[PDB]
Structures are given as structure tokens and as C-alpha cells.
UniProtKB/Swiss-Prot annotation, chain B:
Subunit structure and binding partners: Part of the 30S ribosomal subunit. Contacts proteins S9 and S11. Cross-links to IF3 and the P and E site tRNAs.
UniProt keyword terms in alphabetical order: Ribonucleoprotein, Ribosomal protein, RNA-binding, rRNA-binding, tRNA-binding
Function comment: One of the primary rRNA binding proteins, it binds directly to 16S rRNA where it nucleates assembly of the head domain of the 30S subunit. Is located at the subunit interface close to the decoding center, where it has been shown to contact mRNA. Has been shown to contact tRNA in both the P and E sites; it probably blocks exit of the E site tRNA. Protein S7 is also a translational repressor protein; it regulates the expression of the str operon members to different degrees by binding to its mRNA.
GO cellular component terms listed in the entry, alphabetical order: cytoplasm; cytosol; cytosolic small ribosomal subunit; membrane; ribosome
Keyword Metal-binding among UniProt keywords: no
One GO molecular-function entry: mRNA binding
Other known facts: The strain K12 sequence is shown.
Organism: Escherichia coli (strain K12)
Protein name as it appears in the record: Small ribosomal subunit protein uS7
From Swiss-Prot, chain C:
Name of this protein: Small ribosomal subunit protein uS19
Pfam family, one: Ribosomal_S19
Family matches, as SUPFAM superfamilies: Ribosomal protein S19
Annotated organism of origin: Escherichia coli (strain K12)
A cellular component term, taken from the record's GO annotations: cytosolic small ribosomal subunit
InterPro entries for the chain: Ribosomal_uS19, Ribosomal_uS19_bac-type, Ribosomal_uS19_CS, Ribosomal_uS19_SF
Subunit note: Part of the 30S ribosomal subunit. Binds S13 and L5 and cross-links to the A site tRNA.
Annotated PROSITE patterns: RIBOSOMAL_S19
Curated annotation (Swiss-Prot), chain D:
Gene Ontology BP annotations: cytoplasmic translation
Family: Belongs to the universal ribosomal protein uS9 family.
Matching Pfam families: Ribosomal_S9
Superkingdom: Bacteria
Entries under PROSITE patterns matching the protein: RIBOSOMAL_S9
Gene source species: Escherichia coli (strain K12)
Name of encoding gene: rpsI
Gene3D superfamilies hit by this protein: 3.30.230.10
The protein's name: Small ribosomal subunit protein uS9
Presence of keyword Cell division: no
Swiss-Prot record, chain E:
Pfam family of the protein (one): Ribosomal_S10
Protein name according to UniProt: Small ribosomal subunit protein uS10
PROSITE patterns: RIBOSOMAL_S10
SMART domains from the UniProt entry: Ribosomal_S10 (SM01403)
GO cellular component, one term: cytosol
GO biological process, one term: cytoplasmic translation
Family: Belongs to the universal ribosomal protein uS10 family.
Keyword tags: Ribonucleoprotein, Ribosomal protein, Ribosome biogenesis, RNA-binding, Transcription, Transcription antitermination, Transcription regulation
Function of the protein: Involved in the binding of tRNA to the ribosomes. Part of the processive rRNA transcription and antitermination complex (rrnTAC). The complex forms an RNA-chaperone ring around the RNA exit tunnel of RNA polymerase (RNAP). It supports rapid transcription and antitermination of rRNA operons, cotranscriptional rRNA folding, and annealing of distal rRNA regions to allow correct ribosome biogenesis. In complex with NusB is involved in the regulation of ribosomal RNA (rRNA) biosynthesis by transcriptional antitermination.
GO molecular function: structural constituent of ribosome; transcription antitermination factor activity, RNA binding; tRNA binding
Record-linked InterPro entries: Ribosomal_uS10, Ribosomal_uS10_CS, Ribosomal_uS10_dom, Ribosomal_uS10_dom_sf
RNA sequence: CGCGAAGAACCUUACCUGGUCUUGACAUCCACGGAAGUUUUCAGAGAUGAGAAUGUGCCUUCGGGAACCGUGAGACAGGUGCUGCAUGGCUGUCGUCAGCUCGUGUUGUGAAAUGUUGGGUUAAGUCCCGCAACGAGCGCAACCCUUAUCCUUUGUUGCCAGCGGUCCGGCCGGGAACUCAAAGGAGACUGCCAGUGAUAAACUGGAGGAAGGUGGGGAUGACGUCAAGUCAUCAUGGCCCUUACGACCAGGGCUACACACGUGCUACAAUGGCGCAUACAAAGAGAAGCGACCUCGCGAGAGCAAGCGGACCUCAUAAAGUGCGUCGUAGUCCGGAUUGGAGUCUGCAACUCGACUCCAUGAAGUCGGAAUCGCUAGUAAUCGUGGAUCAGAAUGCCACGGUG
């Protein structure tokens, strides 16, 4: 069968939104496009900076972007010149004046985006997918995660028939709405096609 | 109905008379949720049954109802691709239900003008044991006696 | 129908009939304007109306006034099934 | 003093004020025969007041909003029964047996996606 | 006069901490305040097809709730005006105030 | 959805804002019921076709902003129903949670 | 098979006929010449080809740099072209069916088995006993939303019980009771009482209660199956096209019509048709928008123009129903297909090919062969209302209440 998106089913119960602005119907679609262009830019520029989450908030005619990252000295740059030439180009895109804040991810191996792109980077480095999956599962469980499962899909090891292989440890109750599930997705573009990665990380209830 | 064997829903009595069997009769007459239309048809038919052909109104209604109620009907029973017709006694809840259903369907396929006068003729035919609602009763009784050997 | 405050005709067709009005009978006028209405000013001309692939000549008679030019050029060819 | 009740049926809501003594029932500043043309709606608003006997003993001032004919008449009957149990409180246990104390919670079921109605499915064909 | 203040937001926790901020800024500055009242919440529904190609009967249904709060103010002092124009509100509350 | 189809769309709305909502005067003012009902109305009906075959908001297909999909559009978000759903589950549209009533 | 398509006159549009372009309709980099915009000029079906007017932002750290236009040469752009049997993502389906497994131990040469079977029980691999198994995971249940009862808080744009007044309309003074609005809290657990049961788990019944045994409905879809669906949402490996399989324009087409099938709508009437009078809803939408009052039109509509970003204004006088009159069982005062004439509105434009109005026309159809579908209660049946898409254009889809 097909599953529900575990972040989408938990909005307003245990997981918050990544955008926290208000609009009427006139200004709604243009705030949504400019949020798309700001997120598209920061993903491409900070690709080697391990960015997990981009929270956009808009007060009255402002914008402030909070970049959750595991590696904050490289998004900051040498005492703060890299975030200016981030906010001299974000306010370019949004039109409104901009502010950039940066939040440190303490344990980057309990973050489902950072685990998914770590597996994705190894699959493009020509690493066997079992090692990439099993090291990611062991590293998160040894840090106190209550459960994890990873899953890769599509032409594994250059095989000509695609497969979906997954590996679970711990406890991942996807039907429980109190469950703090961190889920994300990444794609790896290799010489034989696209390999999709999915990571679920459980951290406790309520 | 495999597992959850149920009770039953309780219904209102008739407003003009205090009858729950007339409330069942208006329900069987009712088409597409039109209860107000169906009470006017029964009350029109019950008046012209009472005033033209002998009074004691709902006393006359059950005199017509007694004469169409069956006492034994037939039911299939599948064994091996040859399925017998076994006579079974009719429950008295089902007795009133079959009698009122046969009268409404008899009164539907007439040629008179109103529905109330088709109903009035069928109740006056049934009070004197004629018509076609009575003949549905003995056709069931003929078939029940025909398969009497399979008791 | 279109409402009573102005029949429709294109301008390139309106000018082209105007110069066939004074300068006389010509070759049939090639047009693509099937949506134009037939005026009094066009009786006697032959308008070749486009129908998708060809230009069908239409000799304008007095009963064609107030109709469209596209009505005298069938766009679908069909003759029997089997 | 006025003794009060609130009753509701499907989408109707009725407030009921009872006053000590006579047989006047007035509903939305009209009386019963002017408001409810249907005899069935007249009887179910009468119904709580014949188990308790009130010849002409209680004036009833009632207003109602929403729903239709049978919805308003059931919302009145539930509002009367709550006003009479405020009125003396010995009436409850025979009013329980008559089923008038129960709020009828039967609401209209919502239309569902893929279905023509709440439960009506489109016509199936094997091929 | 009276000054009337309308608050709308997508969240109800965030909107009534915002009303609690402006009911207590306004008699800390010493004005009678009227309300706050909750106006009816307008919910807008959407219904999409989830499959990229066919399968018409497989759908999702979504909703946006817009909560509304109304505060009227009885005693608009000079101190009241400069208090609640310069307040620290969140990014989700929209304010539109009436003279 | 075919780069040229979007460029046809981008050019259509930019050329629609070029003329109309500014010079809709040619039909909203002169083709009126009073003394302009003489030849000046008729020249206005002729003048309306000098403007390009675009210019009119009735040729906006109103596609999705990311993929350019012409069907399944939602005017509230500007995105197609595939991209509305894909970004709502990611938590990107504010206040958009799954409805259950 | 009313499926993608939540809405093909042009556009959309991917197809056809014809007219046209070749570093390009869309992007980056180089060189040179022009600041962008303005607004008219004649040809042409249009794309495309020919004059006037003009800007000069900006620091020049004075060579010019930054926006926008044209031309030139290349890397390149572009492809709704092929392969869903190379893929990602997403979706259908068995099926909301109660299942599907693992660790360690034990048994078997082994594939494997046990656990997960057995006695009961449950909606449930649900729970309790027994037992070479002891534990665990994904499912089940619960946590979430809504509906049914009460309490607290707040009281307008919502409300009117007690009051004063009134033009008799909550409309004014006023009231904070009630309806309602939306935040918080309470309530239902087989909790209580009998009986049955293996001193069990659980069943039948009763009390109380708004609600009783999963209270109603929704969301939620395990491991997997069908090389199931989608390269035409997007993304993507390989292949193919590169003065064309790319790009622009006009007109046509997707609406053809001997036929067959699927899903619907309206009927074949008297439980009805028509005429007049008169009750009772919910849920929604609205600024290139919803548009009242009044005047004109038989009408669709038009003119004028208030209010409303909205519990305030508008869409918007619900229909079935009820009362009276008429028709009197007919191919009809049933049915409203088809066609003729005259119009309205939207739009550059209603010929192909829009919706609606008026007058006239008044086919088939009298309950449907073999066969077949849906539904267990506020359900079926029937009656209206709203929304998305949308300039205009629902008998479809998604929602809402009435009767029942
Ligand atoms: K696939
Ligand atoms: K084992
Ligand atoms: K491909
Ligand atoms: K066409
Ligand atoms: K249909
Ligand atoms: K059919
Ligand atoms: K047309
Ligand atoms: K007729
Ligand atoms: K429309
Ligand atoms: Mg209904
Ligand atoms: Mg369907
Ligand atoms: Mg359009
Ligand atoms: Mg089918
Ligand atoms: Mg076309
Ligand atoms: Mg098993
Ligand atoms: Mg076993
Ligand atoms: Mg279990
Ligand atoms: Mg066991
Ligand atoms: Mg569950
Ligand atoms: Mg209070
Ligand atoms: Mg296949
Ligand atoms: Mg074209
Ligand atoms: Mg078609
Ligand atoms: Mg109106
Ligand atoms: Mg007949
Ligand atoms: Mg069932
Ligand atoms: Mg009907
Ligand atoms: Mg509808």
C-alpha cells in the first residue's frame, strides 16, 4: 500500500510548519513563490554546508530566514561576511528586507535530512549501499535514538532490475500521532539512474 | 446478519387515532419520504371505508386486515442443486407486514381515479373476501398445501 | 447571436472589398476571415474562403447578406461510412 | 418565576419558558395551529404534556431557530421536557421511560469522496 | 472615541496570546477595554487528486482555519495609543485597527 | 512543461498588462449608449482589432508556477494539485494541514 | 470507459494545411553599436518588413562600470521525440483484510519447525489460561479531527428573559439571562449492580446517564502481490532529432457519424400537471470581485448606483410542504426532444463550435427481453442550496441542509 507522509500527518499535533507567515488570498501565492525561490537558492548555495531545515517567517513587510545547520561556521564564514552576501541576495529575491539567523544542529546523525544526504553522497561516491545503510543505522542508534529505519530504491549497485531494500532497528510506530518522527527524503543521481533514499528517525512520544 | 443480531426501532403511533399498525401502514404506503401526502391518502380512504360501507372505522380496517393475513408460507432450502419448497408458519409480525404490503400493491394496480378510492375499494373487497389482495393470500395457501409433504 | 450594436467584420477584408468595389471584378479574393458577416457591399464579388487547407470560391448572392463567410465553406469532408 | 429549558433536534434549537397557569402555547409570536400546519408536529409538541397532566395549567412561550418542520417540533419537545424537570424535578423517571429526555443525536452523514451520497455507491459493472 | 482592533491568524494559541498581550497592555496603561470576543472561524477546504495520472476516486482533503478576535477599546488615552502601536507581536498575527 | 509554452505564457501576461487594464477605454467608454452610437462607436469596434491577438486576459491559460501544468490549477496557491500536495506534506504552505471533519 | 481534463470558440494545443525563422521563442559567457520606455506611419491573414519623438540612472576610484535593445562567431539552447520491461517520486489493488516477521534458546543430516499451535474469548495475533519456548518489532487498539450533554470565561457586527419607551422592525434606552460564537474544563472506564463462566479472560441483563459496551462519522492502509499505472506534472540512465522531431503565425481539427458499449439526466403522470396565496434550512463565496434600492424591458437583461475584504454588505424570496381552484385517466392541461423566427450577455471574435430568454413547433415514450447494480438508519429514496475550475461555458465532481 501507500503511506501517508509522516511529517504531513503530524502538522499541528507534534510537528510545526516550516513557514510561519500570514497572508490574505491576494498575497498568498506570491509569498509562496518567493518562499520557493529563497529556499531553492539557499539549498544550492549551502550544499556543502549541511543544512537541515529552512524556517521562513514574515512579519509585517519583513522576512527572516532561520537556517538550521550542523556546520554553522561555514554558513557564517569568516566572522560573518558570508551571511551578509546571503542576505544581500535574499532581500534581492523576496523584495522585502531580510534577516538571516543560523541555528546549530547539535547531533547531525539524528537529523533525517542530514542522514539522507550523507547516504546520498556516499552512493554517488561509488560506495556499496549496504555499508552506507548499516553505518547510518548504527551511528544514530548509538546516540540514543529510539528507532530508525532507512530505505534505498532503484538499480542498486548498477543492477539492471531495480530493488527496494530497507533496514530497521529499534521502534518506528508510524501510526502513532504522539510519536516524534523525523522523516525526510533525498535522491542520488548516479551513472545508472536515480536512487531514492528515505530515513525515519523516532525520538520518543508526546 | 451473521454476527450482530439486533433489536428493533420503536415508532410513533398515528396522530389522529393512536394506532401503531396504521403508522406501519402509512410507512408502507409512503413513497420517497412524503409522509404528509401518505397520511392524507389513508385518512381519506379510511373515512370512505367507514362512512359508505359500515362504520366502526379501524375496527373495519382490521376486519379487512384479518382476511388477507397468511398463516403458512413457503421457503426455499438448498441441499444439492435441488432446493425444496418447505411450508413454514408465518410470524405474526410478518403476518401484518405481508397483509399490508399485499393490500398496498393491490391498491396500486387499479384503474380508479384517486389513490384513496383504489385503497377504499381494496379494503371493501378484502372485508368481503374478494379482489386480488385476498387472491394473493390463497395463492400462497395453495402452494403451501401443494408442498405439504415436505413438512 | 451577436447583439444588435454592431455586426462584425475584419478590417483587411473591409478594405479589400472596398478596392474591389470601385476597381471592378477581379480574381477571387483570398481570405482567412470566416467570422465576418456578409454586407450589402459584397454582392457580385467572389470570395475564396479558407476552410483549413484550400480556398473555396463563394459567389455572393443577395440572400447571403447577414450570414457568415464560414457558412459557405465546409471544413469537414465526409461521404458515407461503408 | 419563569422555568427554562433548552432542546435541540437535527439542526433546530428551541428555548422554552414555562409560566404558571393557563393553556396558551405561543411559538415565535404565533400559536401552535398557525405555526405547525402538520398534525404530527402538533402532536409531538403536545406529547410531553399528557404524561404530566396540564389541562390549562402552564403558559408556554417558545421560540425556535433552524432546521425544518420535524426538526423544530422535536427541538421543542426536548426543550419542554427539560423545563418541566426544572419545574418540579419529581418528573424525571417517567419522562425517562417515555424516551423524551434523550437528546436524539442522529445527524445527517456527510458526503464522501468517490461516493454519490453518504453511502450510495455508483453503479458497478464487471466489464 | 472607540478604537477597534481585529486579529486574524492561522493558529489559535498564537492568536490569543496576542490578544492577552493587548488586553493587558491597555489597562496597564489605564483604559477600560471591551472584549476580547471570538468571531466565527472561517475554514477554507481544498480537495486534490493525489495520483499524477488517472484514478479519480483517490483524493486528499485539506483545510486552512483563520481564527478571528475582536477587541474594542473604551478609553483611548495618549498613553494607550503609543503603547499598543509599538508592541512585540508574532509573525503569524495580522492586525488591522479601526479609528 | 515545454519551455516555449511557458515563454508563450510569460509573454502573454506581460503584453496583456501592457495594453489592457489601461486602454480598455476603446470598448468600455466609446461603445456606450449615448450620442457616440454614431460612426465613432463603429470606428471603435474597428480599432479594437489593431491591437495584437494577445493583449486580452482571456488568453491567459494560468499555468502552475513551478512545472507549468495547464490543468489541475489552484488560484489560491498558484501551483498545480501535484505541487500543492507535495509541498503541503513538507510543511511549506502555512496553516495547511489535512482536513478531517 | 462524467478516467488524466477542477471546465478544447481563439488561447489551451501537444494534431492537420499553408505562410515563416536558424546561437534561436527560453539561459550563461565574448566583441561592437545603441540608455530602456514613448507612438504614430504604409504593406501583409498574421507572424514579419519601412519614418518622426526621445531618454542620459549612476558613481566615475572619468578607461567606463550597472539595468534594457540590436547585430556577429561559437560552446550551446530546445524536444509533450522513443523506452514505466533501465529508474526516482507519486498512485491504484487485494484490504482497514488480521495478519507479516525477527533475536536468543530448543528440535531436525537438511530444506525447515517451534514461538504464531491447543482450550476459551474478541471487531481484532483482542485478552486470559495451557504449552520448549522466552522476548521483541511492523500492523490491531489508543493518542488526532468532527458530532451528541453540561460547566467556566468573554459579549459585537451575534442574542432579547425581565424592564422603560416606540413609528410596532431588537428598532432605541438598556440587559449579560437565553440562543449562538470559540477558548478552557468536565463526562463513558465494562466504572457500578446481579447472573453465567475454568476462584479466569470475557459474555447476557439492569441501574444511573445527553450518550453503553469500538456512542455515530472521518483521517490513519503492515510485509508484500499484479515487470499494475504514469518518461505528457516534475525529475532521470540510455537512444534519437539539431537550416528540424526545435521556434513563430493564420485558419481548421480534437465537437466528424452507418454503428456497439459504459456512466448519467429527463420522462412515460393523478402519491400528479398547471394557477394563486403562504411556512421552515445548512454550508459556502466575494475587489480586473460580489453587486442591493429605484427606473425601463413579457423575459434573458439594461441604465443608474449604495454597501462590503465582510456574524455588519451582497450573491440570496430554499424547494419539496401546506391551503384553495382546475384538469378526470386521454398519447392528455402527461412528456419537452427536434426545428423555424426574434433576442440578450461574455469575449478581438459565438459559421464550423457558447450559455440563456421570448413566440411558434410538440418526436419517442404508457414502466422496459436475456441479464444486472446500490443500500442495514438520519441510511435508502426524494427535494432544493453552495464551491472549485472559470472572460463565458455542468445532467460531471466536491460539499450542505429539508422530508424521511
Ligand atoms: K514506478
Ligand atoms: K528461531
Ligand atoms: K528519459
Ligand atoms: K477549432
Ligand atoms: K448525464
Ligand atoms: K444509461
Ligand atoms: K461558438
Ligand atoms: K402537451
Ligand atoms: K464561469
Ligand atoms: Mg441529503
Ligand atoms: Mg466518478
Ligand atoms: Mg481561459
Ligand atoms: Mg470502472
Ligand atoms: Mg484550437
Ligand atoms: Mg501467521
Ligand atoms: Mg504452529
Ligand atoms: Mg497485538
Ligand atoms: Mg502461546
Ligand atoms: Mg489504529
Ligand atoms: Mg456569562
Ligand atoms: Mg507493464
Ligand atoms: Mg492557432
Ligand atoms: Mg474529447
Ligand atoms: Mg437578487
Ligand atoms: Mg397513462
Ligand atoms: Mg455495514
Ligand atoms: Mg421530481
Ligand atoms: Mg450541485
Amino acid at each position: 500500500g501507500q503511506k501517508v507522509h509522516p511529517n504531513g500527518i503530524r502538522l499541528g499535533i507534534v510537528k510545526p510548519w516550516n513557514s510561519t507567515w500570514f497572508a490574505n488570498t491576494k498575497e498568498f501565492a506570491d509569498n509562496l513563490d518567493s518562499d520557493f525561490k529563497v529556499r531553492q537558492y539557499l539549498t544550492k548555495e549551502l550544499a556543502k554546508a549541511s543544512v537541515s531545515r529552512i524556517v521562513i517567517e514574515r512579519p509585517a513587510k519583513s522576512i527572516r530566514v532561520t537556517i538550521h545547520t550542523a556546520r554553522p561556521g561555514i554558513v557564517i564564514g569568516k566572522k560573518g561576511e558570508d551571511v551578509e552576501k546571503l542576505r544581500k541576495v535574499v532581500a534581492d529575491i523576496a523584495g522585502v528586507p531580510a534577516q538571516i539567523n543560523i541555528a546549530e544542529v547539535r547531533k547531525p546523525e539524528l537529523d533525517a535530512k542530514l542522514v539522507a544526504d550523507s547516504i546520498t553522497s556516499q552512493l554517488e561516491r561509488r560506495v556499496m549501499f549496504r555499508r552506507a545503510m548499516k553505518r547510518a543505522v548504527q551511528n544514530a542508534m548509538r546516540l540514543g535514538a529510539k528507532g530508525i529505519k532507512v530505505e534505498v530504491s532503484g538499480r542498486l549497485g548498477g543492477a539492471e532490475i531495480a530493488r527496494t531494500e530497507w533496514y530497521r532497528e529499534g521502534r518506528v510506530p508510524l501510526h502513532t500521532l504522539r510519536a516524534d518522527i523525523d522523516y525526510n527524503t533525498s535522491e542520488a543521481h548516479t551513472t545508472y539512474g536515480v536512487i531514492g533514499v528515505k530515513v525515519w528517525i523516532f525520538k520518543g512520544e508526546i | 446478519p451473521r454476527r450482530r443480531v439486533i433489536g428493533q426501532r420503536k415508532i410513533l403511533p398515528d396522530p389522529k387515532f393512536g394506532s401503531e399498525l396504521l403508522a406501519k401502514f402509512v410507512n408502507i404506503l409512503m413513497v420517497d419520504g412524503k409522509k404528509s401526502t401518505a397520511e392524507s391518502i389513508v385518512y381519506s380512504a379510511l373515512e370512505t371505508l367507514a362512512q359508505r360501507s359500515g362504520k366502526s372505522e379501524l375496527e373495519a380496517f382490521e376486519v379487512a386486515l384479518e382476511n388477507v393475513r397468511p398463516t403458512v408460507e413457503v421457503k426455499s432450502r438448498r441441499v444439492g442443486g435441488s432446493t425444496y419448497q418447505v411450508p413454514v408458519e408465518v410470524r405474526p409480525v410478518r403476518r401484518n407486514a405481508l397483509a399490508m404490503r399485499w393490500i398496498v400493491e393491490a391498491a396500486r394496480k387499479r384503474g380508479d381515479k384517486s389513490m384513496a378510492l383504489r385503497l377504499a375499494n381494496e379494503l371493501s373487497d378484502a372485508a368481503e373476501n374478494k379482489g386480488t389482495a385476498v387472491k394473493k393470500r390463497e395463492d400462497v395457501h395453495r402452494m403451501a398445501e401443494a408442498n405439504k409433504a415436505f413438512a | 447571436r451577436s447583439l444588435k450594436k454592431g455586426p462584425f467584420i475584419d478590417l483587411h477584408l473591409l478594405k479589400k472589398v472596398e478596392k474591389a468595389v470601385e476597381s471592378g471584378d477581379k480574381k477571387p479574393l483570398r481570405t482567412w476571415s470566416r467570422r465576418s458577416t456578409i454586407f450589402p457591399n459584397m454582392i457580385g464579388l467572389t470570395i475564396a474562403v479558407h476552410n483549413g487547407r484550400q480556398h473555396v470560391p463563394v459567389f455572393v448572392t443577395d440572400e447571403m447578406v447577414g450570414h457568415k463567410l464560414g457558412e459557405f465553406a465546409p471544413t469537414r469532408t465526409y461521404r458515407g461510412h461503408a | 418565576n419563569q422555568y427554562y429549558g433548552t432542546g435541540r433536534r437535527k439542526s433546530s434549537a428551541a428555548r422554552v419558558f414555562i409560566k404558571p397557569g393557563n393553556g396558551k402555547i405561543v411559538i415565535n409570536q404565533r400559536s401552535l395551529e398557525q405555526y405547525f400546519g402538520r398534525e404530527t408536529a402538533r402532536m409531538v409538541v403536545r406529547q410531553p404534556l399528557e404524561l404530566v397532566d396540564m389541562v390549562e395549567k402552564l403558559d408556554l412561550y417558545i421560540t425556535v431557530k433552524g432546521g425544518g418542520i420535524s426538526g423544530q417540533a422535536g427541538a421543542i419537545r426536548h426543550g419542554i421536557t427539560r423545563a418541566l424537570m426544572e419545574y418540579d424535578e419529581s418528573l424525571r423517571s417517567e419522562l425517562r421511560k417515555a424516551g423524551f429526555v434523550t437528546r436524539d443525536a442522529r445527524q445527517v452523514e456527510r458526503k464522501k469522496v468517490g461516493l454519490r451520497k453518504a453511502r450510495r455507491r455508483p453503479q458497478f459493472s464487471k466489464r | 472615541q472607540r478604537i477597534r482592533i481585529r486579529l486574524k491568524a492561522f493558529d489559535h494559541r498564537l492568536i490569543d496570546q496576542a490578544t492577552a498581550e493587548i488586553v493587558e497592555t491597555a489597562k496597564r496603561t489605564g483604559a477600560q477595554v471591551r472584549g476580547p470576543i471570538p468571531l466565527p472561524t472561517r475554514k477554507e477546504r481544498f480537495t486534490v487528486l493525489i495520483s499524477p495520472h488517472v484514478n479519480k476516486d483517490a483524493r486528499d482533503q485539506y483545510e486552512i482555519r483563520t481564527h478571528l478576535r475582536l477587541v474594542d477599546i473604551v478609553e483611548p488615552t495618549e498613553k494607550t495609543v503609543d503603547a499598543l502601536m509599538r508592541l512585540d507581536l508574532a509573525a503569524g498575527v495580522d492586525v488591522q485597527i479601526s479609528l | 512543461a515545454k519551455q516555449s509554452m511557458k515563454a508563450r505564457e510569460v509573454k502573454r501576461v506581460a503584453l496583456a498588462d501592457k495594453y489592457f487594464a489601461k486602454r480598455a477605454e476603446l470598448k468600455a467608454i466609446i461603445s456606450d449608449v449615448n450620442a457616440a452610437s454614431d460612426e465613432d462607436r463603429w470606428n471603435a469596434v474597428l480599432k479594437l482589432q489593431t491591437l495584437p491577438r494577445d493583449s486580452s486576459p482571456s488568453r491567459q491559460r494560468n499555468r502552475c508556477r513551478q512545472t507549468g501544468r495547464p490543468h489541475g490549477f489552484l488560484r489560491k496557491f498558484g501551483l498545480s494539485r501535484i505541487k500543492v500536495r507535495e509541498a503541503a506534506m513538507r510543511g511549506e504552505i502555512p496553516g495547511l494541514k489535512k482536513a478531517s471533519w
